[PDB]
Amino acid sequence: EKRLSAKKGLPPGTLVYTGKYREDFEIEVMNYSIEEFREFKTTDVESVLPFRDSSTPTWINITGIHRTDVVQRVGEFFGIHPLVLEDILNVHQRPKVEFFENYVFIVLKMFTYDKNLHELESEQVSLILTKNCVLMFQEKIGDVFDPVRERIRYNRGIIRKKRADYLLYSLIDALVDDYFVLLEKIDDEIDVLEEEVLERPEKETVQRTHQLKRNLVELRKTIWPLREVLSSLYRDVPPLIEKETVPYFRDVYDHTIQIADTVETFRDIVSGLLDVYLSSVSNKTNEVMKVLTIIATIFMPLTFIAGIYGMNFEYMPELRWKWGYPVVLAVMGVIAVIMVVYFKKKK
Amino acid sequence: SAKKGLPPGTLVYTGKYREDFEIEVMNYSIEEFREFKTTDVESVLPFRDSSTPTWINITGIHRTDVVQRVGEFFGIHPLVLEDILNVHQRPKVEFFENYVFIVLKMFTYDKNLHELESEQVSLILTKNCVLMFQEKIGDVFDPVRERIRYNRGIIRKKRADYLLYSLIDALVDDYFVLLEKIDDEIDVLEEEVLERPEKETVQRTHQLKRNLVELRKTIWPLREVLSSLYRDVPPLIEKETVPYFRDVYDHTIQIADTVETFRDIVSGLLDVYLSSVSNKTNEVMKVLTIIATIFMPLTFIAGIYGMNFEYMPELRWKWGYPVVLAVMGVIAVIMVVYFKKKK
Amino acid sequence: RLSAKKGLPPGTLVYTGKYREDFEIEVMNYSIEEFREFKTTDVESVLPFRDSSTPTWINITGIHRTDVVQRVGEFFGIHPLVLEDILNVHQRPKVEFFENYVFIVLKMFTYDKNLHELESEQVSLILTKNCVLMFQEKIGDVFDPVRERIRYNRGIIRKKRADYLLYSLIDALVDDYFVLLEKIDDEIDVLEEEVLERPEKETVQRTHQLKRNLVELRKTIWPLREVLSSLYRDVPPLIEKETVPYFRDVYDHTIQIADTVETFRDIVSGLLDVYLSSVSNKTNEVMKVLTIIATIFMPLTFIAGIYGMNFEYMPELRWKWGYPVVLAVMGVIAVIMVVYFKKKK
Amino acid sequence: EKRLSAKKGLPPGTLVYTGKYREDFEIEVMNYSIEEFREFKTTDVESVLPFRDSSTPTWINITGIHRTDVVQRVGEFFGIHPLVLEDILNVHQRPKVEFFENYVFIVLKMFTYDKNLHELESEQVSLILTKNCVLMFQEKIGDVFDPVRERIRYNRGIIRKKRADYLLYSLIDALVDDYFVLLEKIDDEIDVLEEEVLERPEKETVQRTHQLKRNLVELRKTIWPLREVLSSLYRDVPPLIEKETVPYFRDVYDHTIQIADTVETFRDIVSGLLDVYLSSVSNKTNEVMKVLTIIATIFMPLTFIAGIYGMNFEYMPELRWKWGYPVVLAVMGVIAVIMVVYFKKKK
Amino acid sequence: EEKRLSAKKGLPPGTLVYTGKYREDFEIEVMNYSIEEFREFKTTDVESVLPFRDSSTPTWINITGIHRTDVVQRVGEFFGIHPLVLEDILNVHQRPKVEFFENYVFIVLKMFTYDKNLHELESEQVSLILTKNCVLMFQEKIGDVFDPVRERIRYNRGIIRKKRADYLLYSLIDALVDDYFVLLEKIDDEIDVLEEEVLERPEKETVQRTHQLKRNLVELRKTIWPLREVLSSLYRDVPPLIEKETVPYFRDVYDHTIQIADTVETFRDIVSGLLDVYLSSVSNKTNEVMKVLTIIATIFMPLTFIAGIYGMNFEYMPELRWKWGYPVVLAVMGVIAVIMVVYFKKKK
Ligand SMILES: CCCCCCCCCCCCO[C@@H]1O[C@H](CO)[C@@H](O[C@H]2O[C@H](CO)[C@@H](O)[C@H](O)[C@H]2O)[C@H](O)[C@H]1O
Ligand SMILES: CCCCCCCCCCCCO[C@@H]1O[C@H](CO)[C@@H](O[C@H]2O[C@H](CO)[C@@H](O)[C@H](O)[C@H]2O)[C@H](O)[C@H]1O
Ligand SMILES: [Cl-]
Ligand SMILES: [Cl-]
Ligand SMILES: [Cl-]
Ligand SMILES: [Cl-]
Ligand SMILES: [Cl-]
Ligand SMILES: [Cl-]
Ligand SMILES: [Cl-]
Ligand SMILES: [Cl-]
Ligand SMILES: [Mg+2]
Ligand SMILES: [Mg+2]
Ligand SMILES: [Mg+2]
Ligand SMILES: [Mg+2]
Ligand SMILES: [Mg+2]
Ligand SMILES: [Mg+2]
Ligand SMILES: [Mg+2]
Ligand SMILES: [Mg+2]
Ligand SMILES: [Mg+2]
Ligand SMILES: [Mg+2]
Ligand SMILES: [Mg+2]
């Protein structure tokens, strides 16, 4: 209803941004050949539009898809189907490839993990590969893509030698790689949490356990498709040159499996955290209940006799007598002493 | 859940909705549009033979004679019409030579008392018509009606199969709304489960589980109905409508992701609460334990010196018990010190 | 009684089930123009119907008479493995295919409410030429409505052939399951009500019985779904454009049941964890009462037991305005132990 | 006595018996056809070597494969691969069916169950179908094949009319039949066990349920390859006479499924047995609390007032107007009785 | 508990970077052999092994200490190994695999070492490349399971000397897969000891060990599953692996691996209940602690109140004055104590 999960009743072609980031808008362009390169930014689309006809590889990054107007304008110019456009704009959706005639279309998820308050956020990056362009579409400023920029700029690696497909591999290889980062953060979280779980009895322990479990589920929900998307890229290939670029997506495929597995491992672990915790607590109850028993179980028989020697009659034998009070205190010290002897097994 | 012993062709509305019956009909082509309502079935019949798209919506299928009649007129096999009127059944598609047959489920989720309801929606695509069969009045189809009416979208331009698409599409899109609500209820529940120790909570928890089960049982085959429509297409215009069906599938893959997601999420809730309440039990134990461990030994010396004995001064010595009182105070001091490793 | 008949050759004919009670053969030969039906204990009398040109339903009941299964089978030309398959009632439902005939094993269920339990009886069907052969363990069945349909000519059955009678028999036999499931659905409803609102061990027990019975149900129903999958997708002596879509309809109910049998499994599966939580909570709130009485009364008996001391020259007895204030302070700490207790109780 | 799971360092054909039984060695032969049959035992492997070339089905039962010379001889004569000989000797393994050029190889297990102290042992059985011979290999004297022996002697059934592949069939069907016996015993154990769990709270119970869980896991591991074992015997069939022996293989294969389902039915039943125990313990903990609390909650407050009225004070007596003792005992009984009243709901 | 080696990022596709924890050893071994004779040697000079690319006879070249990525790059370029394959030899956090190429088979496998006492398992990654007449082996660290295979080559044991490079690769992976037998045995011992502990030893360190075992099992499954797939691909495809000879051998290894994997899922099946068996014991001791607490509580508290109503200072109240009251109250108190014990004769 409000800013989550619903644009409803709108026709099949409606361009609407569903995410939260309306802040920034910036349009980056990097063109390159083996010979030379150029880069620029701008806030005007009419400058970048002519690159669709380029003979040389081009990476056009639109940050600020919160502007539906520029997404549309570009979609139209490169001839992107309106359903596809709409997918780019609706950022709540699963990861996918859709191959078309003159183009490939890809929807990926970048993540961010804040430790301290433990939570994750996800930005949607959409890539379109057509002709010589990779069109990028982001929500906000910030991204994992920088090493690629450096690779182009400082001529490191093979990127300069290759055409646009290997560039889509470059952007996808970065995006996938940052998941390892997120995963390191998360195993750190796991270790911390199992320490806390066996050794540190509070309820905030439970709260954090649960938080990690959800963060893990959302992680997987985005992850398994992400694996299939790479899986598809590997087995089909309409404009992705074979004998050059194929083993490159394939290495991103092995990554997305190594990752898909790692979150599984994570899951099987975190599931039994809470069991370990129940085992910590009901074991802590056991030791308390043992203390209260020996405390109660010594003083309960004693307070009884001390109460039968405080009873008022007349006619009573042992009150006058006497020799009693030392013999009574004797029997008391004796019975509590055989209690403590009886407890040489327990605690 | 039982109509038994009846012949294969027997029309029995098996639903719980007995109240309303209505017939809505919209005939459109590119240049013009015409809509009407009625309770008279024959009046909507001549539309079987037209060369333009028409949406014929029969609400209140508890009236069987209408279903029989319309069926016989459009030439639909009695096994289908029975299927239409038996509303406990899974979403499927049957592909036929002169038509397609589709059963789907709309859901409804009441907050306050938290519960869900289902309507069964049937669709026949034949020649130039979409035949829609609803159990009761009101639907998620209002934006579609508004679209045909107001020439929004491409819908006016298009044909009967694309009308189908818009109908099913609207249906599927509503689940999004339902998911948002379930999400909210889940938020509330987990808040309460870690912070609010009550049995009404375990109930609400189990009910949410049960609901997620019913929802899953519907959602999963729904994924499959679109799976065919996208992949099969005998009288469905290819180059035009196949990509659009492909969308509704995408979404219905999504809805099924979110639902497993919820099941995974809720499935650990009862272990939270168990872990939470097993802790609060432990931390009230401590309180009862300290209260028992100081005040039990103390009440013990109070009982010695209340004993009535002919021997034993105190009696005399007349100091008190500053010293009884002081030994109490000192052993209490050390008990509490001992409990500086605890509460 | 029992689960092993062993050391025996593959052909050997043995009834493994528990009911030796009844024996009866019922025959209905019916055509478009007319119909006739009779019963008997005499086997040579039904044999000639092999060559009848019209639909016959031979329901042989009391398979515990092995010699009749032998007779009829050898006569109609049914293999020895199929005959033994008819006499062994411990087995999974299956469909096997052959030249002149189709072999079918199904299960009818009876669930007693009150004392909650289920028993099964096995029906074997053989469709051969114009005859459909039926085999039961004991008197009574789910098939009366198709009998009624044949006697009174209701619906399309009189027009059509023998494999349509297969269709109808099976359909009836599948439809039973719906009512079964309704019953089991009731059991589940009461059982969960009890589980959250009613902490006893008998409810542990019934939860277990329900889980078990549900297991049995899944185990019968799942191959049963695979049965009508095969009758729908294969079809050699089954008239296609006429019967095959009637076949698909049972195929569809067979599926609906299976999903429902799952829903019940998934729901039963949690019913223990809801019980554990109610008991724990119940265990908690039982503990809280113990403490609050202790923590207000235990320190109370202590300061109330100081002034029961027989020491002379307390002096503190000297306050003898005294006791009401001595009573007061008690209540005060008592109250402040209660005033410890009006948050979190 | 049962060499552990490893013989390593050894090259691939190394023929080593890894089991515990060295005790007996015997060889039994039955040559038969429609007309007649001859049967004999022996310790001499030379006299059973000629039967490889038999026109008519022979059954060679070698018992005592600890004698590895024998297995080597026989193996080399009938043309069996060193890897399969090795497989006949190493008894820690899964069942399999390997189809070769001139012969069929099966390994299968023959279980034995001890009730009382509950545990299961398994002898290996190896079967090689070659030409007209069934080669059969056993660790120890005693087996399940005695009634197939009897059908060969007393000419019961159709076995004499039929061939070597039918011999194979009979043997496998006796194996498979025995797992029913086994399952019956496990069902008995299961019933006693669940009954003891729900009505009988002791620890040797958990010990037993666990024993069973494990035993069923073992039985699963032996049976599931087996289901696939007779699956591949049913669906393939190069030298297995089709129109004769095939519907008989499918018969064993139906059995094999009932056995597995009977296993899976058991598993899902046992995995609930511990949760039954869990819920019985936690109701006992509750029911003990209940008893502690009604005693604590009626008497501790009644002790508080008896209590103030025993105090010896300067203004003592506070009351001493004789009314007025029994009024206190009255209000004692009244607050106790209304404690019971308040407990007339649950406890 | 800090930044772990996982991410090699910002780095190009071909980047050769060792991600392991072993920097210690470096050694290059060679055995070359034929039916007539063989030569074995070590060296740190890579250029001396290189000519073996062109040998007619099978040559196993073991390169221990892949941390030196110049050696790894050398042998790679010289053998025409594609940079991505090279990089995989170098990156050790990754699942076992086969990849087949025009001129070589790349394989990734894993050796596991378990230590008892403090219970923990380390792995080492092994790479193998079937290329022409060579198998290139790459190890992180000295020591390995391939000793008997060397021993066979040296002293002419088995058939290995007659067969070729493909059978040499069979021999290597067979010794590898065969290690997992030992490993599963050790994990079994720990399992028995640990379930005994779970029932009969109520300590928190027991819990620590149960969870530790569980984690070890998961890391062990994660590797062990595709290990199965690696041998399956190897059985069923076979481009330069001589078929009618070497395929059955590869099949055998596949078999043990199916066994290996089955076992691993059985251990998992057991350790998953191991913690519920603990929590059963614990609740049960406390259960039988609370009993003790409650039966001591319920006999004396009705007794301490009977002792309360007695003194208790009031007038009238015989009771006190008729004598006989004290002993008769020892009788009542006593008898009610004995009927509490009698009611508790359904308990202990
Ligand atoms: C030297 C003085 C001579 C006085 C007259 C002698 C008469 C002979 C009597 C036999 C002696 C036994 O006397 C015995 O004393 C003991 C305690 O002293 C009493 O026992 C008394 O105190 C014990 C405490 O241990 C209580 O458990 C018991 O309920 C109470 O009756 C016995 O009830 C009485 O039978
Ligand atoms: C002082 C003389 C030195 C020589 C030693 C002998 C001293 C006397 C020994 C006393 C033996 C104690 O054994 C016994 O104890 C109980 C207290 O539980 C006393 O008192 C008991 O009397 C009878 C038992 O029959 C009961 O009615 C009463 O309830 C009970 O208290 C008995 O009178 C005494 O016989
Ligand atoms: Cl690059
Ligand atoms: Cl009919
Ligand atoms: Cl119906
Ligand atoms: Cl049988
Ligand atoms: Cl071996
Ligand atoms: Cl036989
Ligand atoms: Cl890498
Ligand atoms: Cl060798
Ligand atoms: Mg849409
Ligand atoms: Mg790689
Ligand atoms: Mg019906
Ligand atoms: Mg879309
Ligand atoms: Mg006093
Ligand atoms: Mg049999
Ligand atoms: Mg059979
Ligand atoms: Mg139908
Ligand atoms: Mg070996
Ligand atoms: Mg082997
Ligand atoms: Mg890389």
Author numbering:
A (entry chain A), D (entry chain C): 3 to 349
B (entry chain D): 7 to 349
C (entry chain E): 5 to 349
E (entry chain B): 2 to 349
Manuscript text:
Mg2+ and Co2+ are essential ions for all organisms. In conclusion, CorA transports its substrate in a partially hydrated form.
The major differences between the loops of TmCorA and MjCorA are after the YGMNF motif. When the intracellular Co2+ concentration is increased, it will bind to the M2 site.
